Design a protein around this ligand. Sequence first.
Ligand SMILES: *[C@@H]1O[C@H](CO)[C@@H](O)[C@H](O)[C@H]1NC(C)=O
Length: 573
Amino acid sequence: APFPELCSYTWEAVDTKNNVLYKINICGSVDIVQCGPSSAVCMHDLKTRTYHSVGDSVLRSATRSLLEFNTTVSCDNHRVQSSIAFLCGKTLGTPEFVTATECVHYFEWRTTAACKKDIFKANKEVPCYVFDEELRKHDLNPLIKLSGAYLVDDSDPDTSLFINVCRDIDTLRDPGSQLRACPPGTAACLVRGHQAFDVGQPRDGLKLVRKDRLVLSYVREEAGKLDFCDGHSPAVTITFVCPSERREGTIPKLTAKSNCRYEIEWITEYACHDYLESKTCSLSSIDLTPLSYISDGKEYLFYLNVCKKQAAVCQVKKTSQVKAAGRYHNQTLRYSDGDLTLIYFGGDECSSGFQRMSVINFECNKTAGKGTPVFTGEVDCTYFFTWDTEYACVDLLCGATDGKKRYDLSALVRTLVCKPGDLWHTAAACVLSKTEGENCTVFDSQAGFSFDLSPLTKKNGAYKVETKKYDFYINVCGPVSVSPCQPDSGACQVAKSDEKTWNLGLSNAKLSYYDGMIQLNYRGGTPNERHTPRATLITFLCDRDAGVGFPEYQEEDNSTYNFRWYTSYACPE
Ligand SMILES: *[C@@H]1O[C@H](CO)[C@@H](O)[C@H](O)[C@H]1NC(C)=O
């Protein structure tokens, strides 16, 4: 069970009560020296910051569904250990913590990498989760598409940008439907008509940036082409954002697309953090009461009941020596990020010091007509079962979409066809459309309201943006007005290393508007020796409670200069 697809990454799983993070490295070693040179599983336990390797990379073995890592440490029999129960899954997934004693530490992982046919596997998929400062857990595996992709919103009628979250786009399981042309392995495909291009491919996993912003980056350096990418390496950077009363809630939106450096922002509920728990046969949502049962073993044979005199799980040998492998009272039902896991603890103490536990991994399956538990292995008197059942079967948009034509209600937030700007027939109803203005204003004639950014326009244009290398000075609609730059430029780069500056483009007040984005483009700027004068993009984005806000430089090429500006000036009010 090497599972190549799980190499190269140091996964994370959390135990929410004890307040511990474990770091799993199945193919190698956690790269923490505090943990130790040969840790494949690592206890942190933030609460009293300490470290313990509860699994050595060398001392590894499999057993049916399980992978297990041993260590040469006494406890109490005596040896400390960690194990993962592997189930097949639709995405690469994450490991979820099950339970721990002073010796054993158990997990389960539902993943593509535990399927014995590769048709289900992605050309390339990446970890689609992160943990924040309070080990909360943000995870976008629900967004991952198995076939097809997400049309990214952009006014341009000619070209369309499709993406998948954390993996390549499977174009085969819908033959004929628009995407066929897309080069194999692409997570970001650019259609221009009948021709398709790979503008992005998975490499690293999901990142957490500035507290609460998930960033995912696709790249393509192993490349050619650059017909229209002027010697730029095509790249995609998506920013997932947890909705709020402030932040709209949306489909994904193209905020930049110069130099084949696509920048997408996507307000989606799956960006928010959650780990439920109960000693009952249900949670806060479905009950497991509707679910006597006879699971076959090696030498042995199992018997299980809904919810020892009692015994919820019973082992007998096919030899009528019988042992109980799970009580009734001592129970824990748990929903951990999509995974429903029931445990029993009762346990007749086996030869060794432990009491027999049963861990059941309920999978969702309609065509089960209830469902049946399969035995999937045993480790130090803990018996694992996977249960396909319908009774374990458990992203609300304000605006719809057309053959590329969007719709959005927002100014109607304290059947409808639209009306000329009236705002029940309402301007808010029908198609969204790009409009351009000037004098630091733009009028969305459809919706009936116009935006005016003019109060940002500074009279000596010090807006002060520090990269740890450069000091960008910019201004809105008006020009800059700072030490080295010309009073010409609306944007200006200045290295602190040197002090050497570059005009990033001449200012103008020619606003653009489309689907809640406002855009300033400066086009002068210092010259690749085709001509290539520098330019700046500044996408302004509605945030009801951002106020005026502040610009933020978007990391790209040496050569590309996009800033973002969250501000309530881009909002309808
Ligand atoms: C659900 O159970 C049926 C039983 O025949 C099986 O065919 C199918 O593969 C199962 N699906 C999943 C996703 O477990």
